[PDB]
Design a protein around this ligand. Sequence first.
Ligand SMILES: NC(=O)c1ccc[n+]([C@@H]2O[C@H](COP(=O)([O-])OP(=O)(O)OC[C@H]3O[C@@H](n4cnc5c(N)ncnc54)[C@H](OP(=O)(O)O)[C@@H]3O)[C@@H](O)[C@H]2O)c1
Ligand SMILES: O=C1C[C@@H](c2ccc(O)cc2)Oc2cc(O)ccc21
Length: 320
Amino acid sequence: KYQCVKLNDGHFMPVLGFGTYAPAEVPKSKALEATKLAIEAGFRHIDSAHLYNNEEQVGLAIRSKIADGSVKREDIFYTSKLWCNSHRPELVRPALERSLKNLQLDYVDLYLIHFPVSVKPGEEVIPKDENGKILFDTVDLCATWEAVEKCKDAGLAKSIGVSNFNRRQLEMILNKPGLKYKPVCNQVECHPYFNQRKLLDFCKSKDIVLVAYSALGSHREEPWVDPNSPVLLEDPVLCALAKKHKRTPALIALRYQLQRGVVVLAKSYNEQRIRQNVQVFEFQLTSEEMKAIDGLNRNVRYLTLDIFAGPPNYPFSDEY
Ligand SMILES: NC(=O)c1ccc[n+]([C@@H]2O[C@H](COP(=O)([O-])OP(=O)(O)OC[C@H]3O[C@@H](n4cnc5c(N)ncnc54)[C@H](OP(=O)(O)O)[C@@H]3O)[C@@H](O)[C@H]2O)c1
Ligand SMILES: O=C1C[C@@H](c2ccc(O)cc2)Oc2cc(O)ccc21
């Protein structure tokens, strides 16, 4: 269904969203078809990023569902993200305008700082030196946020937020001198094996929505995810609750987040699963079942973004 949460700037965010990242080996055209099917199934919140190299396709999909009259622009909540190669203040608006041009949309509903570690400016999203290590850059993320705030001023992003920020980095933005807009959200990995209780409580404490990514246990694309990590959707408790409720493990995992106050994303380029995942609104977990899923917490982070560790801004060294 279309139920939403009110953000701290007064905009409304659909509580279920459609993830659009797919591994590099997935052809770009598949993003176009999956996003159309997502909108037909009921999805109104759509999550992309300049990193995903799909905004031309995702924009084509959204504007085709507008053109055929299925939805109007105001019904769609579209998220993009500012990548690490344009953290520098003077490059922030160029990057947003470049996403909008690829999308052929006048504005995004939500613009996020994608990841707090900066890299060398340029066309390459992961620039590398001769020994294969990332060419990091040195940027004041408070200066980045101010340039992101100016993007809201200009009406090019209706809301603004962050992703992959730990509590320290959230506090750096929240307590910045002259802050215009708080982040409306922190988009972070969250699933029953990494349920982010502490970070979720902290966001709640500052009127920041936690948006769960990798909520079904991630794409598991090598070399980003350890292939020896456990597979979330094989979990016996999730599978047992799925049987009990006549649902699926993915649907238990998404319902879990909805009942604990989290906005949840779900990626699928599969028509059946796309349509399946919107069924998260048709059933309820009992409080005893929520507690059983709470017990699944394992400290298994699927997406470490290890290749960016080293700089002070690497977000996952802190406890949360
Ligand atoms: N740093 C960031 O901000 C960041 C990082 C990671 C992700 N994200 C966002 O969050 C989204 C979701 O995370 P994710 O891409 O890691 O994936 P995910 O939502 O955790 O799960 C995707 C995987 O689960 C499968 N799946 C989907 N629905 C299913 C169902 N009902 N039953 C069984 N399997 C199902 C997908 O396969 P099929 O496609 O074949 O269904 C795919 O293999 C991303 O697309 C992106 O929008 C953001
Ligand atoms: O799966 C990953 C690993 C990594 C990454 C993905 C693609 C890429 O081109 C470079 C890095 O960061 C991410 C950020 C995202 O928002 C979504 C997925 C991933």
